[model samples]
Target: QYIVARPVYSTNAFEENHKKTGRHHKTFLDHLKVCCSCSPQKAKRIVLSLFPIASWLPAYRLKEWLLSDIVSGISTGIVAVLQGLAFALLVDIPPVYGLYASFFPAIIYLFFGTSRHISVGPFPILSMMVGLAVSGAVSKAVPDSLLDDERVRVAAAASVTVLSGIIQLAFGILRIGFVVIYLSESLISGFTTAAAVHVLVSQLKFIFQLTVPSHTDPVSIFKVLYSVFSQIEKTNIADLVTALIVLLVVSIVKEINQRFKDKLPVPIPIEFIMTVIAAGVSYGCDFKNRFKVAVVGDMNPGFQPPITPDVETFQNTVGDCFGIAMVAFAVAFSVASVYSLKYDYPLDGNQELIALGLGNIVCGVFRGFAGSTALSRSAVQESTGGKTQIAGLIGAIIVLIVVLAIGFLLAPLQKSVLAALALGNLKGMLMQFAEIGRLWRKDKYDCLIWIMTFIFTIVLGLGLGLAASVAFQLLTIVFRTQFPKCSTLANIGRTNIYKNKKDYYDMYEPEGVKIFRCPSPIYFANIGFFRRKLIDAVGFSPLRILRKRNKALRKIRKLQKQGLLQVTPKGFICTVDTIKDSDEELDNNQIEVLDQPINTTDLPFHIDWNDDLPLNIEVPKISLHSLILDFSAVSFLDVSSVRGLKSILQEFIRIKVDVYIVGTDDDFIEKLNRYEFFDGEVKSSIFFLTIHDAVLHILMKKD
Candidate 1:
């Protein structure tokens, strides 16, 4: 139901006002010069926007926030180090390079990022995606012996990082900040769940200490699962036991931390403690030599020299880079947006895109893979009372300490333990599988989007799956608009209110008047449908009635020429000939055979076929004389629809039925004038301010 109760205003006055205060047109060069000219305010804003640190740093609350930030940094830094090492395994690079990925992004983000709580670092999902490109590219170009080399793997991953970063920067500069909105929350949830499955399967071989070969096919997850299960017999007992222990302990501590999140001053740092204990135990007992367990070996303590991204590798990995860039930026921005909303601060999506782009490009040159925000790390930073990027700076400093001085302490840490740490954080993402049921109840289309994205991301690979899902989503939009709700409205008793007649039982429609409504934009795609619906509501087709009446006149002319009928001032009286061809319909050929057109002036009397007719002609009954078209929901109209509308109005006019259009937008009327729609019998006089107003005017004219 709709109640248009706004004050009615004269359209002429509005048009006059617009004409009096007309817009001034500027030349292209003038506009360009205006934009090029900048004042100190503009310059300051530009500098602060590009470098957000300069704006927020001076306002830092040192006395109130410094201690909390320091504490938060210590807690978050510990998690970053462990996660970096764990996620680097996903990128198929040495564990130490994960530290580089963790460190440089934080430093760069501190300068450009707007969100204080978000911890920019390696994310498992994007890491795994990058791993696919790295593994595929390096495996193709390198020898089997050199395939396991960290140098080749690191360089390939860096190449992808740079390419993806460049794409992100391009999007940001173009101000395409709304690209992430294309990937809906449900779509991302399903996709992240699918990625978690891939991560889990990839980590299986490490947990069991098995040397299963990698698969790069779209169905690599299935193949990897098969490979891992086939090698289940060779699983190392020590590695399995260690992995399980880490999972159990970490899971327990995490549950406690969540349960007592409000009660606890800071959550327990189980990941760091576990890493230290595992490394210390492995070092003292020499687990690798004694128990046949794999370790994160060969720690390079000092910083590696920055290398330029390989130009040739860009061509090989450009497709994967685009997907990685989109997904990485999407995930990071989602987290950042959430924190900014919670804290009630402004976050620039475009600026964040640029920041992440620069961060990736900078880190890639320093041998880091593509970086994104980790939800768990950001949560830890916020929960630990972090106030600013100062905490992130401290966190980066902690990672630097690991990269420089005491890095070798973790050299003996079991790779399985790192895998367990990565797996431990995935519980929340995996739990998103339950969203399917909730979504199904809320919106069936959204449920389908989620299901399709999840299945395709696993089966068709990440890039193609995302593209396919987006295409499906766009198709849904077109279909939804193409078939919209079309109904005839009726009056609610004793009020200037209208509702769908089919919905309200007590609603009334005025005699000889029908109110037709189409709650969608009228375009070529649905103009035919609108015509059909309108005809159905009015109980007649105007063109069909005209054709049948013309045919009836032709048949009468034939009968009078044959001397079987006589023409009177009233009308022709056909008795025998009417019965002759009345049972069998007069075909178009018979009517077209007459070259002499029948003159309507010969019979001056009004032709009321319903009362009495010279010949028995078939035609639909049109009970309604006035049709009030409710154009309240019609925000747009195309040329084809306007033509169809004009034809419909003329058809009604020929039958002496008045058609009134109500609640049309100003733009719609402007378009009608532009198209000469009102040049004929159809005129602006048929339009009314509202449905009630139209009905009142029609009643007034009848009285």
Candidate 2:
């Protein structure tokens, strides 16, 4: 399945640094030393990797790739212009601002990005998150005198992009690209569900023509909904009518495209067509005057001056801007990785980060918001066989042409229409409801993490919700390993196979011996929990056994405390029915003196501790003659676990109990050597390769 990915560059340098996983019984320095050494040619190769376009541009075949990409780009550009106009409203800026987002990022990525399949542009979740930040910032910063101003709104978006750029740029330069791994699918889905709910609630006011104030609390969505319902009398019939039609048409066209997608070179530009239809209807009917529907009002046909967003607003929006940077990088990589993996090409993770960061950094200068690659558009480009980033440039060029020459044609487009565009496309995030039952059936812990993350984000806005979401996801991960699954092992009929004891009644357990296994990695985070859990599984729990054996002894001790009775060591005693030598069993008739304490350390009563035994004492047969631990799942142990394991073995030896260890590999043997452990056992005799081998050795002792 894994054959190859390419370049004209010598493969020698790439292969050297990534030769192996480099995991060994060595310190952190050894791992660090495995990274590439800066030889002249190696340095040159590294620099070329930083700007992937340098390597791919020389390899570009204009005759073979450009014409197909240009075709793909035109259709995709139509989609982008429609998306930019629509999504700009979601970003809380003028519609043309969305075009600016599409242009600058796409152009920058064309020179820096590695993925030819991805078409960089505004995305939904990122747009809404930016809106949340901008909504508050713009409303607060602008007074009633300037409440109609779009500059504050645009500035808010720009500030977020500025912060997003710096954070993402730093993340790229240092090559700390792998941090996005923390964003699990469950985390992203749960988070999106929450953000979608917020979007649905917040954007409803615009579509329904209900005026609602920006809120600063967790329950903002509910209040907005309440405002909408109460103000239903004030609803604008024209806007509602237009929005409904837009959604209906967009949905139908999208479904039709999907139905015939396999036969088409690209997915149908359904949204663009609906957008054109909405603009025509609104303009022809003069809905803005007659029906009083919301419209884009007026936008200049040319670009705005290259002005920085209010630097003062940067501090306010920077907190949520971190999320913007992360989400953008994650979405781009996630979407592109699909095609790269499918087509068998190298999509350099580090270089991709730098590319997106640089794109946002450039866009931040002229715009309020940032953009990322769209998954749907990227798929379209791949289907159309986009040969290079030239496809994205073609798409961006389309937005540029419209913004300069004919952006005013879109001025008559109803603002309410964009709301429907958002809502219809948001069906997946809203319908993330189904993931709950699926994740529940898959893993209860996963189910809980998803639910908590989702619910919290809904009640709180995205900023607070995202913070809580990350914390909850991490906590669940820790708790999952903290209390790991434990099971007993049993042999399967005269074969080398072993299976869970309770899972099959046909499996046989060896008498006077018990085999135990733990599946979690033994690490500092869960080592203590694993220690306590494992200790209980083997019936070595002192407190539980003492409770049963000392039931009557407790009553006598209470009575003697009142000074009603006097008892000496020899005068007070446990019944002969108590546990006896060579065996361990609970006895109801057991008794004890008030002053003498029971020592549970004397357990494994079957073992001969060489202590004097009462004459003629008869006890039950042996309970456990030996204990075997299966270390097959014990991987990546730290220094502390080695000591803890050695201590467990030492404790067993102190009680005169026999212990056998299995599954010793060179991987862990080195750790055992460092811990001054695995030294007590006879190398060939006690340490074994498998549970069967350990069992055979124990059986030899019995024979």
Candidate 3:
């Protein structure tokens, strides 16, 4: 037996089986009363679930959680603003519009989102995908005269965002939360790991101060790499020096924070500090004019006017919009699930879909490109002790003031420094490459899955890679179920308990009996395999032995008619030459054994298959008198399986070997009855409650 029975010390059995086990024995009303004090409990819960801010706001623990949330919010906000500028460059939009992306999404997510600590804002991958769509659409619709125009590019990007947003909203309304299951943990790690490579490659231009052309091809990674290295000789020393400084400083400080996370009040806001220091250094040294290093030029102090998503770009980019929409939700939910599981809180996945949709819609209208979260920012928020979305709201407020009042504070900040910041944030994802060895030792299939996803994502591009990975994953499922584990079971010591014979040294097979166990659903794909494995488990095939016995019987009868053999108290006595005659000659004989009585009245005893007979009969030694099959693990069976099994039963019956099926569920028995499985020599009485009961019945019948 592969399954072991163990004692469960759980108090609530239903809760033990259910996912929401934390609620234990509580009823719906009991759950409502614990969270709210309203008279209309049901309606109040509905409102609270719909608008999560309403629920958490009233129950705010100001004395305990207020200060930490403020510090965390401020810490995360500064990073958001800088990354906002960083990702906006990836999106090919003005750096100021990135502030709008950072501000609006977080504010909208605050009211509806479930995860308390995840920082909802611009993500580099999401922004890059949007940037590609923007460039492609702009080239198609906008005239070459307006090639570098910002207005049309911005509108095209927003159109893509709004389309994706609408798709997300549709997904939420349809409650298609199950869609994310395809993106398993191994797949996500691989995909994100590849994404880090993409992010790094995309930043190579800024890192070396080389002007590389954007690629929209499916194999854009290879093309981009070629372009970057071709211009490697023309690299700017000033930009490379500034980038190296940022990476070294940021990585070293992060390492220190990780090591001394307990002693430190916070992970020293080093990323924000670097941004401010870089801004001051770049501005004071006049790097923009002196060293030919590109800087975020003169900034606009206020938000852009509200604009509509251009309907013209819809037809060209809608296919990509759907993929981008799913990818955003998949990545966000993956990150959110990690923290929610870590902190032991319930997360509403559908609500998150709705929250992201609404956030994108709001941000798109506000001249913001698509928005999502990053692991580094969320890590900052959680590591700094963010208690709720209150932290997110505060973070959004900071972005508003930066965009409104002090937007020009970082006007002279070098672009390469921001790209380096992006690169440094990728340290975590890059390390996921180490999961390969761990996964290989734990499960080779998962390791292969990780490898497949990583390779495809890097080579075929993100959109195509996801589709390929999902299809590959689905095939693995079919391979897993194609071969069932068939084992020979034996009794453990003198006890009734049964287990696999090889697993226990003390276990022994019963005398003159074989117990075969096939522990998977019998289906069309696996039924033939199940039959073959069953033959290996049981020592001999009853069908082959029966056929041989019939042929030997017919040959003996023919020899008797020709006066070549004589019937005796033993088997028929025959001449050596006659016995040596090819059994191939007997194949032409057409005498059916069942045409006459198999057990002739003249013969005083039954024929022993292994005994010394006069004729040389070619038949395998059948050592067992009975065979028992354990059906404890057979959850289901199809028509082909039932027919194949019935054929096996009939063959065994003809050879006088009793076949017993044990440990079958009521449903399985019902299927057997309906499918005419108990026809001919087979009967309902051949089934038993357990292997022990079947063995006992066989032993008692021998007496």
Candidate 4:
């Protein structure tokens, strides 16, 4: 009887209820009755973990493979030459170090890195960091007059490479890869723009054949410029003309490559080909020889793996290495995160940490100073039919073979040509003013932050720039949290509420009921702000007449004190008289009118400044009571809110005010349940349903 009656009654009752109200309902009894009633379906087991390779690698049929290989080889060869020039200008290292640093790490990363197209190499930012680190360490140890003192500086730079690798590896293992997201894209854009300015200014002395000390400050660059212009007669016209020609050629080629990339065939990377052609023309033309320009002249050429430095050098370089590693992490993680979002790929941020860690570790062992993801090289790989990390590996191998066999061939390239190329790169890195303007329109604070970081990166250095950028971002976040937007709202219909302002004239607010909406999530960070905003809102409410009157009295007093108004007639003789009435002798014969306290008790609703209320006091005590909070205007809530609501309900139960919550959907209910707000006693006390039903229940209880 129990089994048969339970199934029949539950099924019939559910159907009847749905038919009558056209709304589905779940009862606790149904769950207990349906235990062990369902069965699982059987299926075949298949492992598809390695399927991603099929996306690109399968396209590498025999013909495609041959094309890919040739393209990869040529592209890598051109990149190696560019990298060599970059190292010469930026690192001031032996040519062999540049060659090795540009080669092996690319190959290693191609295997371990997840990205199909990103090529690992010695990037300009990394190179700049290494140079700065080495220079700082060397300066601390020796005097500047010892110009050819290479051992200590080289040792210090090597130590930086090793330390950077170890730190990256540790980051990957610890799986805090998402740490890089803290360096926002806006910050990077502004920082790079400033760095470009610094790089260009730093090269001016060499370009103009003048003696200007190495300093990061823009004022120093101006000073050098003043000195150069003041001593214009000493300028080398040949070198200047040669530099300009190289710069123009590189710029035109870059423009052409970008414009025609879509029209060109996939296997042909026009930029790589164009760069090589320009280099070849510059070398064969003997521009330096023809113009009496300054050539790199002689480069120390030989191969040796990177090694650990002495304790002193390590100490000196550690700070620089740490700073550069952070930059590298930020750049790599940002690029990877973008790809992950675009492709709907689940990026293991920690794994990315590991991949970068391994890449740097490999670079250090193979004599590379510091390595990071090269966006240009990676873009080239993607455009040229690259499938997987295999392309990077192939590119790396080609670089190694070129450096090992043909590096000596580049000895004839001029310093002016290298400088011109570096300048071209710097031009590419300049901030797009249009983008900054757009940011300014979107948020003035963000624009200020961007500009501040840019200024500091030029004035101070990369380390200080990074710190300032981080601080600015944090401050912005804190400001937003502390002064979040809040408003009072009133319902117009069953499921709609409008802001309580002139803009929302259509809103229908009952005289006795009031609703306030908090649009921000409540938490420890903004609790004090919420409290302050609430106090101001209630203090100025029309219902608080006494408060407003008191405020007006205060204003009048202040005005009178400032001689804006006279309390009594001043020109004529004013008589002040005090009359003592006979009420003390016969109070029964006198009539007195007593002022009553404003009876605001008729207004049933009252929400505190923190958006909390005593539930029972606001709602009537009956067999059934319903309270509908119109949360259509609320944008977000937090754990503290749920706890607060629970406390309010418990207080209501103390006075036997049956509670029903309305104007919420299943998702909100689920969230409340997840936070344990709908647990045990609170669950039974609270009833969640549609707003219309809640209002109907309240009316029925009152009737």
- Candidate 3, after superposition: displacement of residue 700 in Å? 1.9
CA lDDT of each prediction against the hidden true structure? 0.84, 0.73, 0.82, 0.59
Worst 10 residues of 1 by lDDT: 591-600
Give one digit per residue, the lDDT tens place, for model 3 in 516-634.
99888777788889888877777677667776776666666677788877667765555555455555543345544433324545554457767655555656777788989888888
lDDT of 4 by residue, 146-182 (tens): 4455555556667777788778878777757777668
Put down candidate 2 lDDT per residue, 1-703, tens digits, no spaces: 5444432221223345457565655787867876745688888888788777888889988888878989988878887887777778766567878888888889988888888789898887788778777776665564546545666777778877878878888888888889778877888888878877877776788788777765654676787788789989988887887788888888877678777866875566667778888889878878777877778857677777777657667767667788788888888888988888887898777778788888887787887368888876677777767878888888988988998898668878888888888777776667788999999889888888888888888787776877788888888877877777777889987666787888877888778888878787777787777678667777765333334334433444544565533444334333443333333344555532322334534233332323323323322222666888777887767877777776666555434457776775655765565665655442324456678777776777698
Clashes of 2: 3
- How close to the true structure is residue 350 of candidate 1, measured as C-alpha lDDT? 90
> What range of 10 consecutive residues in model 2 has the weakest lDDT sum?
612-621
Ranking by TM-score: 1, 3, 2, 4
TM-score of each: 0.90, 0.80, 0.82, 0.69
Q: Which 10-residue window in model 4 sums to the lowest lDDT?
A: 41-50
The parts of candidate 1 lying over 4 Å away from their true place are 1-34, 139-144, 147-150, 523-525, 554-604, 638-654, 671-677
Checking candidate 4 for backbone clashes, the offending pairs are 296-415
Task: List candidate 3 stretches off by more than 4 Å.
Answer: 1-44, 132-152, 305-307, 310-313, 342-344, 478-485, 502-508, 519-525, 546-621, 638-647, 650-655, 664-682
